[PDB]
Amino acid sequence: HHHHHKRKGIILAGGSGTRLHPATLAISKQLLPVYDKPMIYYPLSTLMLAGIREILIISTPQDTPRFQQLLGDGSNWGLDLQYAVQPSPDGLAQAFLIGESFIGNDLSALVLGDNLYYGHDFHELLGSASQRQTGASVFAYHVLDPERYGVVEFDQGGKAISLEEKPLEPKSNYAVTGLYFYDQQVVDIARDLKPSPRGELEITDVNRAYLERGQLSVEIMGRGYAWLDTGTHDSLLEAGQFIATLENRQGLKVACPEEIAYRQKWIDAAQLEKLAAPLAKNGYGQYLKRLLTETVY
Amino acid sequence: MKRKGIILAGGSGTRLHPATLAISKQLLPVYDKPMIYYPLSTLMLAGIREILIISTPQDTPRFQQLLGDGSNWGLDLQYAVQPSPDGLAQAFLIGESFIGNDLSALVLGDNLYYGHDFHELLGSASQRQTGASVFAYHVLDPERYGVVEFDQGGKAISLEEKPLEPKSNYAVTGLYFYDQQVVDIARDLKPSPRGELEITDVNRAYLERGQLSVEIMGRGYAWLDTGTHDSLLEAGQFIATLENRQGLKVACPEEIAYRQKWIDAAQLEKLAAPLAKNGYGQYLKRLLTETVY
Amino acid sequence: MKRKGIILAGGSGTRLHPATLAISKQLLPVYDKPMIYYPLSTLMLAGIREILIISTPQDTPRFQQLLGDGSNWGLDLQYAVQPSPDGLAQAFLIGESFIGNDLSALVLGDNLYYGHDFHELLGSASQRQTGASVFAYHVLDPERYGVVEFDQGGKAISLEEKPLEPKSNYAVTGLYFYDQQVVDIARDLKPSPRGELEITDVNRAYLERGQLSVEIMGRGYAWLDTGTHDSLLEAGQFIATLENRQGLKVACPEEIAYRQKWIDAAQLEKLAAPLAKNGYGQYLKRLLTETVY
Amino acid sequence: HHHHHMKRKGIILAGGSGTRLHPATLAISKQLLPVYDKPMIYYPLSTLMLAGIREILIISTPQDTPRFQQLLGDGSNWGLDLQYAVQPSPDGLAQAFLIGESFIGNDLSALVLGDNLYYGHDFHELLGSASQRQTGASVFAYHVLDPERYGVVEFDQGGKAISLEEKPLEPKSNYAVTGLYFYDQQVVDIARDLKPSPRGELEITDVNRAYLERGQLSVEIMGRGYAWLDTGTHDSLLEAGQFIATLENRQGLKVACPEEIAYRQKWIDAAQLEKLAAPLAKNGYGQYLKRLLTETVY
Ligand SMILES: Nc1c(O)n(Cc2ccccc2)c(=O)[nH]c1=O
Ligand SMILES: Nc1c(O)n(Cc2ccccc2)c(=O)[nH]c1=O
Ligand SMILES: Nc1c(O)n(Cc2ccccc2)c(=O)[nH]c1=O
Ligand SMILES: Nc1c(O)n(Cc2ccccc2)c(=O)[nH]c1=O
Ligand SMILES: [Cl-]
Ligand SMILES: [Cl-]
Ligand SMILES: [Cl-]
Ligand SMILES: [Cl-]
Asked: Can you give the residue ranges of the Nucleotidyl transferase domain (chain D) (predicted)?
């Protein structure tokens, strides 16, 4: 007898194989900076903006200690961070098997460790996805090269009717972004997956499962949002220039976890002041200190 | 006479944290390759094959794992540790036994050079068996560097490290050539007011005896700024623009080794095997069948 | 009336480091099972099935991963976090919604009890549906604890938290029974000179209102705490001596749940299976067939 | 074409102890349990360190690996280079050399079991002898009451080792081979040629017999004045805790304190040791590290 009287996050920050070698031979791409902070800050900030405090980071055995040195156990930012290893990159859906015990009986969210989002009312858009308790939620975004992604086809009335992974002839230009919200059915859906031609457990197959059951919500992420990934050397450079333009224009940072934790009330002024101290001599610590006196709307 | 090389890829403190919290700055990519490929390339272009890499205690394994012992590229690489960021001149104390009685050269691990006939300009400094050679480059913010003053006739007459009031806009770049005197000069150095053993004091020592050759690195050369987030980005975009225009890579050690005949066609083919699926391996395999002038 | 249980498994900072860097303290074993099984068993022996486990943000998920919802043992387990080690009395504020309008019991996570008819001693306190009930135990070092003073007739006349000059050698143990007032009492409390919401301050409130019952836990009971390296070791040896003599286990939740009829023979059988290869699983299997008085 | 200007790499087998110590180990895994005042894994780590070994590979289950990584990091705080590898299945102690193949590379190695603790006078010197011989293998033999539980070494009348048997029901001697092994460059190749035993495992005893049969096994006696303790049962863990507690409380000195060992080895200096003492200053361990900065201990 069970008794019924929340949502957990996962960041997949595993090995990107050899695609970006030699740039990534020495370290994981999710530890590479995007302008002024490690790539992993961005997806972490996305989970935090969704209200998620308990987060599992999945990385290679080789890179886990570096993530741990960077992020700790989360206590400094009002979070709980746990770690798991992915000995070989067997696909995105494997996160749910690796993370089965972490997830337990809760709702979950998966974000890719190399995905960056930017836009207005983003916090509010993540809230509406995270509050929806049943089924699955994903976001669709108009791209130039939909063949690189999971692609969602829509009927005349705007209802999602099919998902295809990396189709040679996409039915739309709407790619599924690297952020996914799941109810308690996901671990059992993943467990029943069998590997694709590439030998991978595909997230698209998980999402198609929900779709066939009429439990997939596909929200359009509009053109006034930037969804960037750091898939090529050129795209990583563009992403850093994009963040630098916005930050240097505004004097506000994108995806500063200390800031977000503070604005969420997960840490207070006294704790924020402490986090600022060791970086007092550089731009980042000086930003954190300013946060304490300034009202930002 | 033999010249040994030293790459100093030490700690940049908290200056670029949290971007460098996880990993030292010289293991970060500039566009498509680890930042250290660029100084290693500079030394290779100067004809230097025996090279010591000095890094933090934490990062030396990450450099050793990246570069190996060098035999795959016709190099002889060794590694050593700088436990504290106590000055660029410490390189010659750390590297004393490595250097032995040979000629030497020091390059900073975050220094990026681009321009015409770099191979020639290095070859001339490397051939000088006595004295020291450095390069001065016109910059906008000379205060950040070793600043060199010249008399009306163009002769180097003074060096100041990070002066409050620069005597010129000519900064000394992070590439130094030295004869057999440099270890003994470094050994007698005392810490500065900042608490560092200064490369500029080494260079002043050579200067007082008229044995410092200060060559001008002209405006037609790129000495790229890697000191800030803003400038690491600019450098990435500079390399990308060159490589995407030309279809030729800047600072590809495999290619350089191949062109200096340090490895043969069968060795370069084996190096391309692992990267075959990506742009870098494709580049290395194309090198074998194309004449580049 | 139903009584709800709270186990406070609070953070012990870095007092037990590096032992507890490996895993937090109420997850460390006392001889052959996790520390938290003992206070859980105490609650279970008082007839309490609905239990809230409060711990740190980092530890609470590990307790959840160990114990789950308790359905396997006929329990109803829930979890809550205490952000900062800001006093034991915060348990009632953190736990306000869980407690609802019911009576409660609080047990500290590092407290171990052993003795004859402990079951019956818990029953007496469990059924007093008004006021609060605590237990006094004669100890050698009363200064470490909440100390209770008695007068000539053995009536409790004062409570003092870790007094420099103890008025008696009776310590109040880490087990507390409370009525419906305790949440409002905790809400009105003003933090102590130490800067922590004290449980002794909750107990003084009840005392001053003439509503605190102090029962003697006699010398034939063992009350141990496992809060230091030394004390954990001594507790391990004590449990080992009892268990190896008797061939019976102290604080086995499965056994207690089975003997309380909260799970049946079929359920206990299933719980034994995964543990079949060790002494604990063979023990649960033995309990299906053996009569133990 | 190679050049010279020898390094020995360490491996710690911190494998999954199955269910044998459940439910104690449901919460935290075996080599993360404390022996008195520090995690079990500190003891075999300290042993490798005392042998002069700085580059160390830790092999554990996928679930345990990040817990070890959270405890120990990359080692750089203690002047070490710690690496990690996963053991998917409990397929024998010899599997360490296949899992650890690329880590070892062309170097000498040492393998230590995660649950072995050693204590005694100039253990440092004893390990030196073994660490220094750059060819063949070296093991240590120790008189025990229950040789049946271990690999057992038989000696002839002149004290030369003549056979090794794995967990024999009828032991030829009371000399068990302890869980610490030194190997030359041949071990990986010897290990690749092994086949599962009747028990279904790649057995270290088979590796050691291969060296013995080539006359390349050194068996040094670890004498009765050394303590070699096993920490793999509830009773034995508790006995090991009591033993360390008695020594530390008598001496005011710690057994198997990695920070202390790296400081005395000159792998980290006084300033770095002071940094490490900082966060732990609230307890006996940080205060102990602090005291080491001012006290001369012979
Ligand atoms: N995107 C974004 C924000 O919206 N905010 C504002 C915010 C965060 C949390 C709670 C209320 C407001 C940031 O501080 N950083 C960000 O990157
Ligand atoms: N700068 C530069 C080169 O000049 N060359 C040509 C070269 C190298 C060595 C000997 C003769 C010619 C490169 O292949 N890569 C380079 O980055
Ligand atoms: N102390 C103790 C017990 O008395 N019992 C027996 C019992 C439990 C519940 C109800 C009736 C009898 C145990 O199984 N474990 C114990 O630690
Ligand atoms: N066994 C043991 C030691 O011998 N030493 C002394 C030592 C270590 C390294 C170099 C010289 C001396 C310890 O500090 N801790 C120990 O556990
Ligand atoms: Cl906005
Ligand atoms: Cl040119
Ligand atoms: Cl009894
Ligand atoms: Cl000794």
From this structure: 9-245
- Quick check: CB of D12 below 6 Å from ligand 4? no
Fold classification of A1-297 is Spore Coat Polysaccharide Biosynthesis Protein SpsA; Chain A (3.90.550)
3-state helix, strand, coil in chain A (%, to 5): 35, 25, 40
| B near C: at least 3 beta-carbon pairs less than 8 Å apart | no
Assign residue D79 a region: left if phi > 0, alpha if psi is -120 to 50, beta otherwise? Answer: left
CB contact burial B210-229 (16+ within 10 A = b; e otherwise) = eebbbbebeeebbbbbbeeb
Could you tell me the two tokens for C68?
């789950």
- Report residue C34 as tokens: 């996790």
Report d(CA D237, CA C233) in Å as an integer.
Answer: 10
What are A108's strand-pairing partners?
A8, A182
How does DSSP classify residue B173?
P
Q: Per-domain residue ranges for chain A?
A: 1-297
Residue C44: how many CB atoms within 10 A of its CB?
A: 27
CATH of domain C1-293: 3.90.550.10
Establish, for the pair of chains B and D, how many residue pairs have beta carbons separated by less than 8 Å. Answer: 14
* A3 contacts C76? CB cut-off 8 A: yes
Going by their DSSP bridges, the two strands B103-108 and B175-178 should be labelled as: antiparallel
Optimal mutation site among C20, C24, C69, interface A, most CBs of chain A within 10 A? C69
Burial of D233 (0-12, 13-18, 19+ CB in 10 A): middle
Instruction: Report which bound ligand comes closest to the CA of C287.
Output: 3
Instruction: Nearest by CB to D69, from A68, A73, A87: name it.
Output: A68
CA atoms within 13 A on the CB side of B208: 6
Q: What is the distance in A from the centroid of ligand 5 to the CA of D259?
A: 49
Q: Which residue has the least CA distance to atom 12 on ligand 4? A: D264
Q: How far apart are CA B67 and CA B155, in angstroms?
A: 40
Task: Write the residue with the smallest CA distance to atom 12 of ligand 3.
Answer: C259
Pairing, β B156-161 against β B146-150:
antiparallel
Locate the chain A residue with the closest alpha carbon to C68: A104
- Residue B105 in tokens: 């050269």
Count, residues in chain A: 297
Work out the end-to-end distance of chain A between its first and last CA atoms, rounded to an integer number of angstroms.
48
Using alpha carbons, select from D153, C127, B18 the residue that is nearest to residue A45.
B18
User: Do residues D232 and D30 touch, judged by C-beta distance below 8 A?
Assistant: yes
Residue of A nearest to C61 (CA): A102
Q: What are phi and psi of B216, to 5 degrees?
A: -85, 125
Provide the sign of the torsion angle of the four alpha carbons A136, A137, A143, A148, taken in this order.
Answer: negative
Resolution of the experimental model, in Å, one decimal: 2.0
- Residues of chain D whose C-beta is under 8 A from some C-beta in B? 1-3, 5, 55, 74, 76, 79, 81, 269
Phi then psi for residue B137, to 5 deg, are -135, 130
Query: Residues for chain C: how many in total?
Result: 293
Interatomic CA distance for residues C269 and C265, integer angstroms? 6
Torsion angle of the four alpha carbons B109, B114, B116, B117, in this order, in degrees rounded to the nearest 10: 10
* Sequence-ordered list of residues with C-beta below 8 angstroms from that of D265, at least 6 positions apart, any chain: D49, D52, D79
CA dist B61 and D82 (Å) reads 10
User: In terms of CA atoms, which chain B residue is nearest residue D55?
Assistant: B61
Residue C160 to chain D, least CA–CA distance (Å):
25
Q: Is A281 helix (H, G, I), strand (E, B) or coil?
A: coil
Q: d(Cα B204, Cα B193) in Å, to the nearest integer?
A: 17
Cβ of B138 closer than 6 Å to ligand 2, yes or no, is no
Structure tokens at B135: 């390069």
Which superfamily does D1-298 belong to?
A: Spore Coat Polysaccharide Biosynthesis Protein SpsA; Chain A (3.90.550.10)
Residue B192 near residue B201, CB atoms below 8 Å: yes
Number of helical H runs and strand E runs in chain A: 11, 13
